[PDB]
Amino acid sequence: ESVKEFLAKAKEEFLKKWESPSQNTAQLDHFDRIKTLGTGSFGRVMLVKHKETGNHYAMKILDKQKVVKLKQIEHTLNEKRILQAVNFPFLVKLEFSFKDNSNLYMVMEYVPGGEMFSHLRRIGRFSEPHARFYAAQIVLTFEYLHSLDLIYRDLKPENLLIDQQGYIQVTDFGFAKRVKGRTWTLCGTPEYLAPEIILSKGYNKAVDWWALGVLIYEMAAGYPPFFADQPIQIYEKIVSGKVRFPSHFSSDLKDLLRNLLQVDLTKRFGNLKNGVNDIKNHKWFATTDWIAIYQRKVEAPFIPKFKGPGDTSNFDDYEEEEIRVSINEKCGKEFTEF
Residues 6+ apart with CB under 8 A from 128: 220, 250, 253, 284
Confirm whether residue 114 is marked as ligand binding.
yes
Residue 316 near ligand NTN by CB under 6 A:
no
Confirm whether residue 113 is marked as ligand binding.
yes
Residue 22 near ligand NTN by CB under 6 A:
no
DSSP annotation string for 39-80 = E-SSEEEEEEEETTT--EEEEEEEEHHHHHHTT-HHHHHHHH
In the annotation, is 154 catalytic? yes
CA atoms of 170 and 160, how far apart (whole Å): 5
CB of 45 to ligand NTN, least distance (A): 4
CB of 92 to ligand NTN, least distance (A): 5
CB of 152 to ligand NTN, least distance (A): 14
**Catalytic residue selected from 29, 32, 63, 154:** 154
Residue 96 near ligand NTN by CB under 6 A:
no
Let me know: does 61 contact 43? Beta carbons within 8 Å.
Answer: yes
By CB under 6 A, name the one of 84, 102, 137, 171 that touches ligand NTN.
171
Residue 59 near ligand NTN by CB under 6 A:
no
Please enumerate, as own/partner, the contacts of 9-18 that have beta carbons within 8 Å and a separation of 24 or more: 10/87, 10/88, 10/144, 10/147, 10/148, 11/147, 11/148, 13/87, 14/85, 14/86, 14/87, 14/148, 15/85, 17/84, 17/85, 18/81, 18/82, 18/85, 18/178
CB of 237 to ligand NTN, least distance (A): 29
Would you give the end-to-end CA distance of the chain in angstroms? 37
Confirm whether residue 67 is marked as ligand binding.
no
Q: Residue 76 or residue 271: which is nearer to ligand NTN going by CB?
A: 76
Q: Residue 161 or residue 238: which is nearer to ligand NTN going by CB?
A: 161
Interacting residues toward ligand NTN by CB under 6 A: 37-38, 45, 58, 60, 92, 108, 110-111, 161, 171-172, 287-289
Task: Cite the annotated binding site for ATP by residue number.
Answer: 37-45, 60, 109-115, 156-159
Q: Enumerate the active-site residues.
A: 154
